């Protein structure tokens, strides 16, 4: 009743509190009370139905609804505390029944708790994913109603969690493409002024539109037109913090926009985009997002291309990108550049003649100019004249070392060195002129970094000019100011050593100059950081052990130098929150193709290490000393280890020093990556064998004792930023602790790490999962079984995407010879496989980002190799072929290659039957283009070759084939042989099962060779030696002499 509702709210709060305090009342009793509460909510629905006929206190009815909502808040606290499968299902179904569309209005007083608990409680997947896909559709309908109800103020608070759950551990919303479009339209209808869901819902929309872009690009075009409206919408408003996500979404369109550049999404869209780019600069008036000049681009390097737009299409190479992973400051400022790049992206390919001079060309515009010389230059195809005109302004800027010069130097030198073409001999000394600015840096450490880093080498790096600097390369260094860490590390010395190693090219005293440089390396502002500004080659960086081992390679000895196995071991770690935002979508994109001296140095180093000043520098120099000790053993230092132990004892407070120590352990692994001290030895990790064994590891014993200190799922994101990387390194250290100790102890340790906590390190934990404490099979088998028993101890945790995916990935670590064990491993493997070939995946309800990995594991499941999948892997493959996903589409593209040398005759025929399908829709979505790719692979597959030819005949409607031209020779390097499609079997024998039988539209675009070939073959076509029927009625179409045919 009306008053009974408030009485129930008070009684529920009091009873829940009293039961929780006493703990005598059973959680089963609490679940029964929750069932009674759901019954009371159903009674509330019945009372509303009764009030429909005759009015009984309608305002008091809403008041009773609010009171029952308070009672439901108490009961929801109880349910979040304790959840039973029938009870959780009852609560969820009551929540679902709460939404009444028939009424046309809802109090929504209890609406706050629902989605918040859904995202917060019962996360482990039996309870959560117990709500099936139909429940997700119902949630979509509820969100659609909320869109009309919100701004229902609490509908926004619920929609926050709704957007959090929209792209889930498995989200089939994009699978519901009509529902996907409807929900996208609903989301676009409320361009929210302020919403925590705005960024996550827009990100889910961006991922879905990215999926829609290659396959069914028509829905992608509808979404893109909506985004075109949203672009001017963003051009209207101004709020920088939300503008971060707004620009993120605009950039999500931006790869698709660059796609649409070739064939205009709108021919006039460029001018509108230019206006919106002016609005983008206006929004970027926030000086926080600023110029890329001195972005400080930590860890930039040459010989590996850049990823600023993060699209492989550019082929632009190695721009020194702001690290943005420092703990990632510049990315949002880099966001400003994208806005600039956006206007730079804007042809209004059309601005160059005017964009040459008019622009103020500020540093904020200068970074955009660098982006121009990369990408707009890629899209430019500028002739010699345009480059001749453009280079003049940058050259003049370089002439005067004014404020215009410094921000220019990097981009200008990059444009000079890297371009569409090369240059003439006239600019020869001009490189030294370029070198002058770098010479300027060689003493001026501040502006130095790029100059001393890039284009200080390129003349050496590209042997495209006269060796005039053969005397002049050391000339700037001749200032006795060569020793400079001001730039990207080790570049100058290493490149110079290589260059002078040409042919008597080092026949000069410059080896002594290198010796002086190394001596400076020994004491370069000894025991402390020299400078405070921008920290290049900093102690702040992890290490460059290659420099430590370098000197011998720098030394010229007869065939003695050089090594292998650099082993970065996740050094860049570009992953970052606020960088991980676009990264997981940016992880995958598969658009359809279109358009004794060293002994002396070490001896002095001992005395140098006898004194130290700084602590972070202590870590850096400890790494240097340990690497030299590995380097010395290569030439052949427990004292450096003792010094590092002292430095560690100094950092007694935090564990991030132990994180630096884990970096040093990764350094040992990189020394271990080197075969041994002598090198080129069959022994692996022998170079770090002393580091690992207690001998020469007395200080490492102390570090291991430090490691012995006790101190949704943690693998939250498939595309995971750092910290999850920190979790991976932490698990590595966990392994390292027991490794130094010399499992049941490892079992108790992984028990100390919570299942949710230990869920983070997929590859890291999987490595130990493959590892066995002893060679005895039973112990490792029992440990793996205990791991499965812990994952399924809460069957929901096993049901969770994180734990099951961890098991799936660890299976690949278990994918090996495994000769010793032959007992029950397959049984537990199948017990896992029941939901490893996920029951969701079996129902095609698996993860989208997880879908490609699932196919990769299914291929990694190799029935043909040794042991077949007892359950038909062919059946799963056929279901997946019926199944549809863009990641699964690229997986299907790869599966044709995977089929080769892996098709057992029965399995081959089973796949061939699925390989046979005449599909119309997937061609525009390129799914049937993937089928045509499989058909070309079948042309590469002699097995069922006649079937391959039949599938060639039936596979192509020729829709998009003419423009494709064997994917412009990508599918077939020489199409013309099969462009005139008369295959060996096809040309020699008329294609047949053994009204025109040949489909002209599937055959070719024009009459071309098709009609004449058919006319020529008509004689064999009529009598096709499989039946006498083909002769009949052939003469009616032939309109030729019958007597001649009979002859």
Numbering used by the authors: 15 to 165, 200 to 373, 377 to 399, 417 to 663, 682 to 722, 756 to 830, 855 to 885, 891 to 1142, ...
Q: What are the paper's exact sentences on this?
A:
The ataxia–telangiectasia mutated (ATM), an apical kinase that orchestrates the multifaceted DNA damage response, is the master regulator of genome stability, and is a critical therapeutic target in cancer. ATM/Tel1 kinase functions as an obligate homodimer with a highly dynamic N-terminal helical solenoid domain responsible for ligand binding and a conserved C-terminal FAT/kinase/FATC domain6. However, the activation mechanism of ATM/Tel1 in response to DNA damage remains largely unknown.
Previous cryo-EM structure of the ATM/Tel1 from Schizosaccharomyces pombe in the basal state has illustrated a dimer interface and the consecutive helical solenoids inhibiting the kinase activation. We show that ATM/Tel1 in the basal state adopts a symmetric dimer configuration with the kinase N-lobe suspended, keeping the N- and C-lobes misaligned, and the PRD fully ordered, blocking the substrate access to the active site. In its basal state, the PRD features fully ordered kα9b, kα9c, and the linker loop, which collectively create a complete obstruction to substrate access to the active site. This structural arrangement likely accounts for the significantly lower affinity of the CHK2 peptide to the basal-state ATM/Tel1. Upon activation, the Spiral shifts upward towards the FAT-Pincer, and the FAT harbors a coordinated conformational change, with the height reduced from 200 Å in the basal state to 164 Å. Two of the conformations, Structure 1 and Structure 3, which are closer to the basal and active states, respectively, do not bind to the substrate peptide. These structures were resolved at nominal global resolutions of 3.6 Å and 4.0 Å, respectively.
